[PDB]
Design a protein. Structure first.
Lengths: 209, 122, 38, 176
RNA sequence: GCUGAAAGCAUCUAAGCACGAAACUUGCCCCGAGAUGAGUUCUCCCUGACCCUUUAAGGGUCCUGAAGGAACGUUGAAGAC
RNA sequence: GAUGUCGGCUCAUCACAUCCUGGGGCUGAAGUAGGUCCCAAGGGUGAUGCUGUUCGCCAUUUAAAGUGGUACGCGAGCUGGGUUUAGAACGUCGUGAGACAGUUCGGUCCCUAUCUGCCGUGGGCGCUGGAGAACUGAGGGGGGCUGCUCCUAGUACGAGA
RNA sequence: GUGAAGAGGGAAACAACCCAGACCGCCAGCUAAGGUCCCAAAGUCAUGGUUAAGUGGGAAACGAUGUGGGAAGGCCCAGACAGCCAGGAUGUUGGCUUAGAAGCAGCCAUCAUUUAAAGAAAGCGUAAUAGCUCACUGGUCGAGUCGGCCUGCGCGGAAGAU
C-alpha cells in the first residue's frame, strides 16, 4: 500500500492507564496531494507522485510551477513517489490524509539520519581501541592493520575505515502505531525514527509482515 | 551491572560475608548480571562457625545492585550496594533461611519464591 | 549408505544399478548392504 | 523388446486417437492423453496397437517397450481404473475423507490435510484405512506414495501409514 | 520416490513425473544511467537582422540575454575544504 | 650495494578435510542421548590463573569454543616480554684470553605517502538546443547467529527409570 | 645436442624442448615444425569408424549389466533363460547334554525308501525340530539365453586456500 510524507515534530511519551510509558515519535503528516499518476502504458510502472506542505511562491521555479499547474494543486516543499499495489487507483489532485493509517498498527519509517561528518574507524565501525599505555606510541585510535602481506599486495574492496558517517537514508521497520489523530494531523509511533527534528519522513505500512 | 571480579555482600544467613563473581552464566560473551540473574561466585570471607567455608565455588542470585532496575513506567530503584543470595550449585535453592534487606519484584518468578517469601521488604 | 570406492554384491538379493551416472548397490534383504560409489 | 513386440488389444467401448505422437484414450472412466517420445511409432491395427522403433534412432526398442507398457496401463485405466489400499497402524492414527481432502491424525501436534489431484477419489471404509481409486496409474501411485510419506512405517512396531500389502520386517531393540 | 522399459522379472532413469537444506536466485535494507548500452516520464524557456568567403560548410558584426544558474550576503541538527 | 626474526595487540581475508546451527543414509537406532558416513561454508565460533610463550595444564562457561592458507597474514599499524651487541654474575669447560641454543639481573624500534590499492568527498567534460524535477533499475553492497522456558504432553516410546 | 656466444617460426606466455643458422633491400613465390570455426593466416574438406564425459582439456590400486568389435564355448522348438496358478506318500519323535536338537548349541548315523520329480539341508520365526523361500524340473508361454577370454573408447576412485 502507499504511504505518506510527514515531518518529525519531535519525541515524547504516552502514559498508559496500566502504568506503562511508551516512547513515541510524533510525525506531523498533513494532506498529501497527488501530483502525478504513472501507469504501464505511459511510464512502464504504476505509481502516484505526491507533494506536501507548502512553499513560498517566490522561489517555485517556472518548471515546478508548471508541473503543479497540471495537477491543479498547491505547490509543496517536495515531491515523492509511491509504488501502487495491484488494487488501488488514485486520481490526480486527490488529497490523502493520515487516516490512511487508521488500522495499520505497524509502519516502516524512512528518513535521513543525522550527519556525523568525517568519523573515525572507532565511532564508525565499532573498532576496538588499542592500549592506552604499556608503551603504545601514537596509536590509540588508529585502525591497525589493513591487509595481509605480499600475497594480496592490495587492500580489499569494501575495507572498513574512516570516512563520512551519517546523513544518509535509513529505514526503521515494524514500528508500532501508538495512535492516529486525524484532526491534529498526527501519527504517534512507538520508538525512535531516523533524522533530526524538523526533517522529512516517509511512513509506509510495514512490509515485513 | 555485576561482572567477573565484582565483590558482592551476601544477603542471607548462609555464613558468607563477601563473595566474588567469577562468571556470568547464560550466554557466550555475556557481560553483566542484573537483578534476576544467576552468577557463579567464590567465597572470599565467611563467619567462623557457619554453613559455607571460605573458598567454595557455587551459584548465587543477584538481589540488589546499585545500577538498579527500571520499571515499565521509566522509574528506577537503586540500592546502596550489591548483594546476592547464595544458592547451592546443583538444585539452585537458597542455602540460608533468613533474607536481610529488601529485594525487588524482579525475583517473583516461580523460581525464587522462597526468597520473595523470606525477604522483609518485597 | 556405505560410500566407498569398491561396491560389491554382498548377498543374492542385493543388486547393482547405475542411477544418474553413479553405481549403486540396493539390496532388498536388508538395508545394511546399501552402497554407493564415491 | 519382447514387451514392445506384444501388441496391446483395445477392448470394445474404448476409443483411441493418434495425432502424430500424441495418443488420446476415451473410456468409461474418462480421458487419458500422453505424448510419446520421438523414437517410437505406434499403429492402430484391427482393435489393437502395435509399437515399433522409428528408424535412425538408437535405443528405439527400449522406448517402444516403455510406450507399450504405458499404453497398456492406460487402456487398463480407462476401464475399472486402478485402486490402492493404505493401512494406518498405531494407537490413535485415523483417517477421514471429506470431499476431496484427506484428514489424517498420525500423532502430530498439528492437523495434516492432503489435497487430492483431479482424477483421484478417496474413501475410507473404516477409521484406519484408505482406498484410492483413479484412472491414471502414475498419479494414484504418486498419491499413495506421498500419503505414506507423512509417517512411514517405523521398524519397531510398523506404526504409520503402510501399503495394505507391503511387508514391514520389524526388528527388536537390544536386550538389557 | 511414482510410473517404466533396455533385460517378458526386477529397476528412482534410459523417455516422463514428484518431493527435498541456514548453501544458490529472489524476497528485506542501502548505493545505483560515466548502465559511453550514458534510459524514461512530467514541466519550463528561447521563433531578429546583416555581411563575407576557402562554401554544403563555416566565419563575423549589430540587436537581443529567456528558462535557469552561478556569484555575493544571513546561515544550518549539513560540513576538513 | 639489507626481503626485520618468536609471541601478544588491532584489523582481517579465503579453503573445507564441518566445531555449532541446517538436510539426510546405516546403526549392535525403543525413547532421551549417541556412533559412523554423505550433502552443506549462510552466520556464528569464550572471558580468566601460570608461563615471554605459540602450545599446554588447570578453573569456570558456551549451541560451539573448528582445522588450515594468507612472507609460521599483519613492526613505512602498535608492543618489545623471548631471542643474538656492548655491563655483570652463577654452574660448567679452558693454564688463559674467553666460551655454552645452560641460567641469571640490565639494556635507543626512524620515515611529512609520489605511484598502485582502499575509505570518503569534489571539479571537468560527456550523454546532441538549453533548463528544473521525479523515477526505472543493468548492476553492486549490507544482513543472514542462537539459547532457555511454556503448550502440544508427561502424550508417542519404555518394564521402569 | 642446444644455450653460453643465435636472432626467426611453434610449444598461450616459456635461455637451454621442436623446426631452422639472420650480409643488405623488395607491398614477390615455395616449404619446415606447427596448424586451417572466431580472436588469428589457412578445410565449418572428403570417406569410414568410435566416444557422451565437455572425456578431449590432470591423477593410481581397485570397482561396475556404459557401450564398439573379434575369437571360441555351453544351455536349448524333445521347449531353453526369466516370470509364473506349479511343492512336496522317510520307518521320524530314526542317535543330542534329554521321558523328540534325529537341521539350524556340537558330532556321527546319512541305514530302510517314495515319485514323473522331488530333500538327513541355506536361511529366517522360534536358541526349538512346528513358517517362509529349497539347487526340485512336472505344467504354461514359445526364441534366444548364460557366463568367461582378448581388445577400442569412456565411468567412479578425484578435497585448498584473492
Amino acid at each position: 500500500m502507499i504511504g505518506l510524507v510527514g515531518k518529525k515534530v519531535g519525541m515524547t511519551r504516552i502514559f498508559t492507564e496500566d502504568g506503562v510509558s511508551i516512547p513515541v515519535t510524533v510525525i506531523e503528516v498533513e494532506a498529501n496531494r497527488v501530483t502525478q499518476v504513472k501507469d504501464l502504458a505511459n511510464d512502464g510502472y504504476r505509481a502516484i507522485q505526491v507533494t506536501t506542505g507548502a512553499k513560498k511562491a517566490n522561489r517555485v521555479t517556472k518548471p515546478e510551477a508548471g508541473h503543479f499547474a497540471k495537477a491543479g494543486v498547491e505547490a509543496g516543499r517536495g515531491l515523492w513517489e509511491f509504488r501502487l499495489a495491484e488494487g488501488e487507483e488514485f486520481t490526480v489532485g486527490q488529497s490523502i490524509s493520515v487516516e490512511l493509517f487508521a488500522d495499520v498498527k505497524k509502519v516502516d519509517v524512512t528518513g535521513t539520519s543525522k550527519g556525523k561528518g568525517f568519523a573515525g574507524t572507532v565511532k564508525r565501525w565499532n573498532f576496538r581501541t588499542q592500549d592506552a599505555t604499556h608503551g603504545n606510541s601514537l596509536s590509540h585510535r588508529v585502525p591497525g592493520s589493513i591487509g595481509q602481506n605480499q600475497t594480496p599486495g592490495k587492500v580489499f574492496k569494501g575495507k572498513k575505515m574512516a570516512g563520512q558517517m551519517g546523513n544518509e537514508r535509513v529505514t526503521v521497520q515494524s514500528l508500532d502505531v501508538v495512535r492516529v489523530d486525524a484532526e491534529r494531523n498526527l501519527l504517534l509511533v512507538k520508538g525512535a525514527v531516523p533524522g533530526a527534528t524538523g526533517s522529512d519522513l516517509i511512513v509506509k505500512p510495514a512490509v515485513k509482515a | 551491572m555485576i561482572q567477573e571480579q565484582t565483590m558482592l555482600n551476601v544477603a542471607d544467613n548462609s555464613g558468607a560475608r563477601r563473595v566474588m563473581c567469577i562468571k556470568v552464566l547464560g550466554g557466550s560473551h555475556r557481560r553483566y548480571a542484573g537483578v534476576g540473574d544467576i552468577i557463579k561466585i567464590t567465597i572470599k570471607e565467611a563467619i567462623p562457625r557457619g554453613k559455607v567455608k571460605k573458598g567454595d565455588v557455587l551459584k548465587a542470585v543477584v538481589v540488589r545492585t546499585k545500577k538498579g532496575v527500571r520499571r515499565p513506567d521509566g522509574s528506577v530503584i537503586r540500592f546502596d550496594g550489591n548483594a546476592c543470595v547464595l544458592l547451592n550449585n546443583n538444585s539452585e535453592q537458597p542455602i540460608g533461611t533468613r533474607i536481610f534487606g529488601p529485594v525487588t519484584r524482579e525475583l517473583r518468578s516461580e523460581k525464587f519464591m522462597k526468597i520473595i517469601s523470606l525477604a522483609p521488604e518485597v | 549408505m556405505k560410500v566407498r570406492a569398491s561396491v560389491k554384491k554382498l548377498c543374492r538379493n542385493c543388486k547393482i544399478v547405475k542411477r544418474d551416472g553413479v553405481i549403486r548397490v540396493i539390496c532388498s534383504a536388508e538395508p545394511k548392504h546399501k552402497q554407493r560409489q564415491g | 523388446s519382447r514387451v514392445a513386440k506384444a501388441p496391446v488389444v483395445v477392448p470394445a467401448g474404448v476409443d483411441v486417437k493418434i495425432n502424430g505422437q500424441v495418443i488420446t484414450i476415451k473410456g468409461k472412466n474418462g480421458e487419458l492423453t500422453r505424448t510419446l517420445n520421438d523414437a517410437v511409432e505406434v499403429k492402430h491395427a484391427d482393435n489393437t496397437l502395435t509399437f515399433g522403433p522409428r528408424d535412425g534412432y538408437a535405443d528405439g526398442w527400449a522406448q517402444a517397450g516403455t510406450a507399450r507398457a504405458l499404453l497398456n496401463s492406460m487402456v487398463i485405466g480407462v476401464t475399472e481404473g486402478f485402486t490402492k489400499k493404505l493401512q494406518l497402524v498405531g494407537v490413535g492414527y485415523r483417517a477421514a475423507v471429506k470431499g476431496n481432502v484427506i484428514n489424517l491424525s498420525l500423532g502430530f501436534s498439528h492437523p495434516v490435510d492432503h489435497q487430492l489431484p483431479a482424477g483421484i477419489t478417496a474413501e475410507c471404509p473404516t477409521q484406519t484405512e484408505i482406498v484410492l481409486k483413479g484412472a491414471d496409474k502414475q498419479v494414484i501411485g504418486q498419491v499413495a506414495a506421498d500419503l505414506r510419506a507423512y509417517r512411514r512405517p517405523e521398524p519397531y512396531k510398523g506404526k504409520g501409514v503402510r501399503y495394505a500389502d507391503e511387508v514391514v520386517r520389524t526388528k527388536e531393540a537390544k536386550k538389557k
